[PDB]
Amino acid sequence: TLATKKATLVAALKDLQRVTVAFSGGIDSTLVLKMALDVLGRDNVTAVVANSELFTDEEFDKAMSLAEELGANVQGTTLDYLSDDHIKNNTPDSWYYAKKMFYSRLNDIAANNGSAAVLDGMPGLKARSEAGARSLLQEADFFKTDVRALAQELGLTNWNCSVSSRFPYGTTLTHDNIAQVMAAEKYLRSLGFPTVRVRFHNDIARIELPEARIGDFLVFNDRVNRQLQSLGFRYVTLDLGGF
Amino acid sequence: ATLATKKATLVAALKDLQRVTVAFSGGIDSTLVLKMALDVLGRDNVTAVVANSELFTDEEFDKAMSLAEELGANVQGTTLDYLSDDHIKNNTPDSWYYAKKMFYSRLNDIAANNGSAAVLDGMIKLKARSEAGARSLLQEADFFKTDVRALAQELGLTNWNKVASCSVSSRFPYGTTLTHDNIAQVMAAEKYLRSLGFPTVRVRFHNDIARIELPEARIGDFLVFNDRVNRQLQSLGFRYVTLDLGGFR
Amino acid sequence: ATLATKKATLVAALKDLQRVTVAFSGGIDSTLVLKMALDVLGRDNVTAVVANSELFTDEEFDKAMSLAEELGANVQGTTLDYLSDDHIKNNTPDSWYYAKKMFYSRLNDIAANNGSAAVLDGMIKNEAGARSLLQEADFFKTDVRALAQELGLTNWNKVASCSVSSRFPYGTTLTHDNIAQVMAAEKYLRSLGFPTVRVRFHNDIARIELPEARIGDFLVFNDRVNRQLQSLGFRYVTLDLGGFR
Amino acid sequence: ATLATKKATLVAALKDLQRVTVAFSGGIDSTLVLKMALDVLGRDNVTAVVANSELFTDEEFDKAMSLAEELGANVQGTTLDYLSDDHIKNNTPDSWYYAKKMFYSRLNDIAANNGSAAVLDGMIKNKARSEAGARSLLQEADFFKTDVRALAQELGLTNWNKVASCSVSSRFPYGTTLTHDNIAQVMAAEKYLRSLGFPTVRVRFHNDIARIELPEARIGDFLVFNDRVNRQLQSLGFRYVTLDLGGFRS
Amino acid sequence: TLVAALKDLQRVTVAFSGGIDSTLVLKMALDVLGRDNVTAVVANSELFTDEEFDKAMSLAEELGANVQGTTLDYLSDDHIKNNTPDSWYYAKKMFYSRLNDIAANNGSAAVLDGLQEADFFKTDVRALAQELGLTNWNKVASCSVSSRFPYGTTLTHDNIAQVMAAEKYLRSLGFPTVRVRFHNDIARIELPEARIGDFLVFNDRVNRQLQSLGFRYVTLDLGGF
Amino acid sequence: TLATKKATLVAALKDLQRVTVAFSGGIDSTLVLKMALDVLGRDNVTAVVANSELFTDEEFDKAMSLAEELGANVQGTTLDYLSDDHIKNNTPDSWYYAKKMFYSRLNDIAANNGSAAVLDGMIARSLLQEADFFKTDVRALAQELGLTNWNKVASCSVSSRFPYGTTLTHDNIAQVMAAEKYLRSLGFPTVRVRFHNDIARIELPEARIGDFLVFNDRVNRQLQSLGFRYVTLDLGGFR
Ligand SMILES: [Co+2]
Ligand SMILES: [Co+2]
Ligand SMILES: [Co+2]
Ligand SMILES: [Co+2]
Ligand SMILES: [Co+2]
Ligand SMILES: [Co+2]
């Protein structure tokens, strides 16, 4: 029932008349913002892209114009995830208390602009369930093979991780050492390794590279060491296991 | 004539047949045919067929299913046992023929059982195609790669499997009997080396010796995987896992 | 503003120009201009021009001829005498002026001889005998890739070529022999799998500038690059420990 | 002035002491002292002592036993639990002091229980030593690093454990409690890396992180062992095995 | 205890090959029995290198021994020429039967070899070799050429010399520890795994050279030595 | 045999009674200095170590101490090779007028202290080479005499780093000399920094270039600070 899953999907869209969509630039939320724009109009849809200290200023700037390209009045809001004790200390369920802090902000924008629901692209209770979010994609049994299909069906051609992963569970995130990691990875991205993570270990940086790249990386050893040392690490290391 | 002449000459035969079945691969030729047939005849008069066999990679097979689902074509999968044919099993210089002959003979059955007037494929400007009643609709309109790349870009086609991996028989010397076992022995080795970050690789079969052909630029990057590839391909049945000092061919 | 807006400003200026001549080189920026001009003014109001010269590789020229015909453009090939200018042959800091003047003035002649309102080229933010129509719409390097993805453009020269005169010191006169000596050296290295490379000329010494990421991969070709470039006239073939600039 | 005048001063104190106990550490300086004591006093009035402990490798210890037996000395080994010292177990910046103090304090027991006039060591002309009394006979005769090599060639001394090893406590940060487990955790890592062909290496301890210091010339050759060094040192208890991008003693 | 067995024999014959074992044995027999009461034999064969012969000949004259060389045709043995896994048996017999003849013709009480009767270890032989002043010895592993060939591959002067030639070349490039494995048209290079990084630059040269020696494919064993 | 080459060596050594040795710290001149001191005594052997612009002040200070360690009456002499016009311009025959400037000093020192000859190592008498001494034997006798320290770095004359006909100066010599010890410091004892005005050409054994990859950026900055505009690695390696 292929076009009958679009039928279940479109059915809920007309029910809400006006929505606020949580835009993440990914293929799923790009599919949601487009379907909301083609069914409810540009004025009954408010796209929101969350900016934070945990995402690269390029990753946020990418999704804002990607929302403008679909022609939706997109609003960017900023979140201090570090304000949550669960996040600042980085517990293993920190993504939950993060996804919760998000939707309540989206629920504010939805309530302040007259939205029937908040839409998105899909420890305690569920993060959406608690905030009253509507994940219309999963409610209609979308698969990985369906979303990629409908994006081509709608003419979608352009579509695009969080820094808490660079830190161990239970290592206090600070405004200082995040920029210490964020700046370190931007350096290694510039040196010719777009896929890299700089793992935090207090006074030790642990550099994970794809093992194919470890050979090409050899020449930058002294320079990466000296640069990341200036950024505050006492020891700059390469994880012998790679990424 | 012009690129505009060739687009209409291409569509001319498309409407002539009303309902078609495309032999879909990941390349631009079969993708341009699948897209143009879908843009002219609709998904209901277009059935894409992706051939599975012991001779081609399951990663390339699963890829062509998705390019047909992403292009919006009612895609059907058929499976081929090339090894049942004596000419293929022995790996003769004409093994590609009896493989291509066994292939097109299958699609004309699928064409007759789904109501197709012809079978389309991506031949542009060998005999086995012109024997089973197969239309090379691109070649019928004098399409060149400069025309196929031009018209595919015009339709917005940017995504296609560029790695048109040769037939796995190429990993074997001429006259080395292909078996269900040693064919999978090659596929597993190459899939591993492809998984490690080297998309261009061939594992040549030489009885108890594996010969790895890698581009010479990449051998610097490959140093780190030495111990693992040896032990891995040894587990896959080779007594010796070696790197060809000469690189790719 | 949005990418949706910069596209309007582009077509807006194109309708104002009605008929144009695009200076096609093969890079992603000039590829975007040739396609947008054909999709706004048609095949008959767009003349693509690919300039051949001694300072650029006969391979980079052939790419832009086929890439222009592949986009469906009336492609014209012109041949240029950069060395015919005294200021360039001796390789002074003024080579860029008298080279670009000869280029734009050659195309400005085609413009009057092919009936174009202007000559267009691919210049982005970050001479004026021609219109840089992308910078007028404030396109950046990240936006050109964005509009190229929207239009389906897949063939473009991924390594931006450059004038061969940079390989020689300022004030070392270029000759047809030492020019080809460098070009042939780079063409060999290009064939081995290093598309971004420069062979810097220092008389009997070749200085190879390679991206520092690649130098590890390059170890295996050492003896061959030496032996080939030695046969091409260099007494010493060396790798610059500093890499590409 | 010359060497042959210091070799005089060296022999002078040796006959003066009649019977001595030498602290042999396999190094070039301690090899010269044990040899000169055997040639001046005879084998029966000289006892060489080589300490086995948790701070030096069970592999490096056995060699100094072979160098002492090969020089023709009655070598007796004593074992010390440095961790029994409150200051060493915590690895304070002064742990070297209370460690060398525990060293000389043991030797003076062996010297008093076998009848020696002094304790000898190879300290030469290059702070807890003499508060137990050990005499630096080479340094007392103004021997230099070039003088020890000169007199060793004169005596036919050619074999010595040139890589004078360091104490395994240097592999740990200041203020990291040493345990019988994590000391062997480092020692086993270093012994593996030595076995693969990198004789000069240190494995720095950082809890769940091993930090591998290799000579930066060697890092190119080391790539092929990446996965094997990682997994072996992981089985030795480390969660993450890393190579210090700054190399040896960064 | 070591010298003790030497005095028992009055006159002995030491088998010098070039390794540290035969170097330590030949010297100690001379220091206990004198230069005239020790007869050294160094084996010449189709299975050994012209340098290993020169290695033991130069080392025996330097240690002060009356060195005698005999030559053996191992390929003449049916088990070796086809090289079955028991060729080492048919190989070891042709050697020892030759030495038992020479011992009677030089007035020797025994024939010596690399040693095991005195519980010498690899760490112990190195101790007496430095103690006895031995500084010249074949530091490169001397070995029989049959190991480069699979069990059951007919050895010929052409394909044996085909293998032997590759190893001397690679040893010249700066890799003294190397074996070149024969597989008809495939050469398999065993190199110490640390060196494979250093070996990278010689790839094309080793390939082109070893192709000239008759191999269709020159390969590096990913597992090394 | 070998034990003959030593008795033949002493035979020629006593025939000369008193000698002057050209010590260059290498093992060969070390074997000569030990055997001559052990046959004639410290008072009948004068070791001479040459200081000049063409060898490193580090190789000189090392060779001085190696003579004092073997117990030899060591005298230091200074040579002005750059004062020789044939050397300063580095002509293809500059090697000749250099070897003559060297031995002419040593033949003077021999006569002013009463030496019968000037001695040197190889394979002015050359007693080692005169006795059919080989490279495998010289290392053997060094262990026999108890010799363990010797400069296994036969640092050739620095004139080879400059093309023929490039005037050597005290300044550009130090530009080359300092560049090489830096490269020696990183772990490559066999290396040459070839001078080409604003280009340095680094010769490394092709085996070592794999080991060399990581130091690329650092070698550039140091040698650039030392005056080279471009620091390069010779793709052809050593020789
Ligand atoms: Co805060
Ligand atoms: Co079957
Ligand atoms: Co690479
Ligand atoms: Co205890
Ligand atoms: Co002067
Ligand atoms: Co190396």
Numbering used by the authors:
A (entry chain A): 3 to 124, 134 to 171, 176 to 258
B (entry chain C): 2 to 126, 136 to 259
C (entry chain B): 2 to 127, 141 to 259
D (entry chain F): 2 to 127, 137 to 260
E (entry chain E): 10 to 123, 148 to 258
F (entry chain D): 3 to 125, 144 to 259
From the reporting publication:
Nevertheless, the tri-Asp site in LarE represents an unusual metal binding site that selectively and stoichiometrically binds certain multivalent cations. In the apoprotein structure the tri-Asp site is pre-formed to receive a metal ion by a hydrogen bond network consisting of Asp231, Arg228, Gly207, and several water molecules filling the site. Notably, the arginine residues form a positively charged ring around the tri-Asp site, limiting the metal-Asp interactions along the three-fold symmetry axis and likely responsible for only one metal ion being captured by these residues. We observed binding to the tri-Asp site for Ca2+, Mn2+, both Fe2+ and Fe3+, Co2+, Ni2+, Cu2+, Zn2+, and Cd2+, whereas Mg2+, K+, Cr3+, Cu+ and Cs+ did not bind at that location (data not shown).
In all cases, the Asp231 side chains bind the metals with bidentate coordination, with a seventh site always showing extra density that we modelled as a water molecule. Even in the case of the low resolution Co2+ bound dataset this extra density is observed. As 3.55 Å dataset resolution cannot justify placement of water alone we inferred the shown mode based on the observations in the other datasets. In general, soaking experiments reduced diffraction power and had a negative effect on merging statistics; especially the Cu and Co datasets were of worse quality than the apoprotein datasets or those for other metals like Ca. Several metal soaks (Co, Ni, Zn, and Cd) also resulted in binding of these metals to surface exposed residues. These partially disordered sites only appeared after metal soaks, showing a significant electron density peak and in some cases anomalous peaks. In most cases the surface site involved only a single histidine residue. This resulted in higher B-factors of these metals compared to the tri-Asp site. For small molecule complexes in the Cambridge Structural Database (CSD) the most common and second most frequent coordination numbers for Mn2+, Fe2+/3+, Co2+, Ni2+, Zn2+, and Cd2+ are 6 and 4; while for Ca2+ they are 6 and 7; and for Cu2+ they are 5 and 635. We reason that the tri-Asp site captures low levels of contaminating metal ions, most likely Ni, Co, or Cd, from the Superdex 200 resin used for other protein purifications in the laboratory.
